[PDB]
């Protein structure tokens, strides 16, 4: 088990950066839900 920042870098940061980028581009109506849905639809590409 890695340090905190290292652990998040290797698990969720890459996909999170992508979801935040889509969020900032499209400014969708329910951003928290939109971001949660984005993480689920794309989990496999980073899992």
């Amino acid at each position: 088990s890695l340090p905190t920042r290292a652990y998040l870098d290797q698990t969720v940061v890459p996909i999170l950066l992508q979801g935040l980028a889509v969020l900032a581009k499209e400014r969708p109506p329910n951003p928290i839900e939109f971001l949660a849905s984005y993480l689920l639809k794309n989990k496999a590409q980073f899992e």
């Binding site: 340090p3 905190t4 920042r5 998040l8 940061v13 999170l16 581009k25 400014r27």
Partner: protein, 214 residues
């Protein structure tokens, strides 16, 4: 009105360019075509110290480049430095150009050279350190080319004479990062960099919340 975010990354502009220039799919490489014509980057800077690099990929005989900075009104069908809106550095003999006046500056540059482009636009235009344009060749400061420049927004800019090829690197990683000055990479102007900085700051905060700091 949706926020005018511009391009996610700093690239060579899609439409703010001479149509005869040949621009790569990744919009970081450009090839000249006949007489001098110009392309600006997709983001420009108004204040602070900023840096980018250009690599001369190929420069056959009888081709040339004038590289540097341009305000939005710089003429796209003229060499860079043709008018009051841009400042440039010429491959041939290292001349610096502004308002079509060429002045001795450095030795020439050419194929394989990696050139650096520094601009500083202090917040205080009266008692600040003074605005400056500085060119670098393969990591070596070539001196202050221009000072007390026209206030405005300055875009990284490339003008090419005939079929030479250059590639622009806005950062964040440079081949010869200057050792003598501080700066932000031009790539910080892409809204994708603002996203990356926002998350990087949040991650630092999370680390404080979870681990503390010593």
């Amino acid at each position: 009105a949706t926020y005018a975010m511009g391009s996610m990354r700093v690239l060579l502009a899609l439409h703010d360019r001479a149509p005869q220039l040949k621009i790569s799919d990744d919009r970081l490489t450009v090839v000249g075509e006949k007489g001098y014509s110009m392309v600006r980057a997709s983001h420009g800077v108004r204040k602070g110290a900023w840096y980018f690099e250009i690599t001369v990929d190929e420069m056959p005989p009888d081709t040339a480049a004038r590289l540097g900075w341009s305000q939005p009104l710089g003429n796209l069908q003229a060499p860079l430095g043709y008018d009051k809106f841009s400042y440039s550095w010429r491959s041939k003999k290292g001349t610096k150009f502004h308002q079509s006046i060429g002045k001795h500056y450095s030795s020439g540059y050419g194929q394989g050279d990696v050139l650096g482009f520094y601009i500083n636009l202090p917040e205080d235009t009266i008692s600040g350190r003074g605005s400056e344009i500085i060119f670098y060749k393969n990591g070596v400061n070539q001196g202050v080319a221009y000072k007390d420049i026209f206030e405005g927004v300055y875009f990284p800019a490339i003008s090419l004479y005939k079929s030479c090829t250059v590639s622009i690197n806005f950062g964040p990683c440079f081949k010869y990062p200057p050792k003598d000055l501080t700066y932000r990479p031009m790539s910080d102007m892409g809204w994708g960099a603002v996203v990356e900085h926002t998350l990087a700051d949040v991650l630092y905060h999370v680390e404080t919340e979870v681990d503390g700091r010593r």
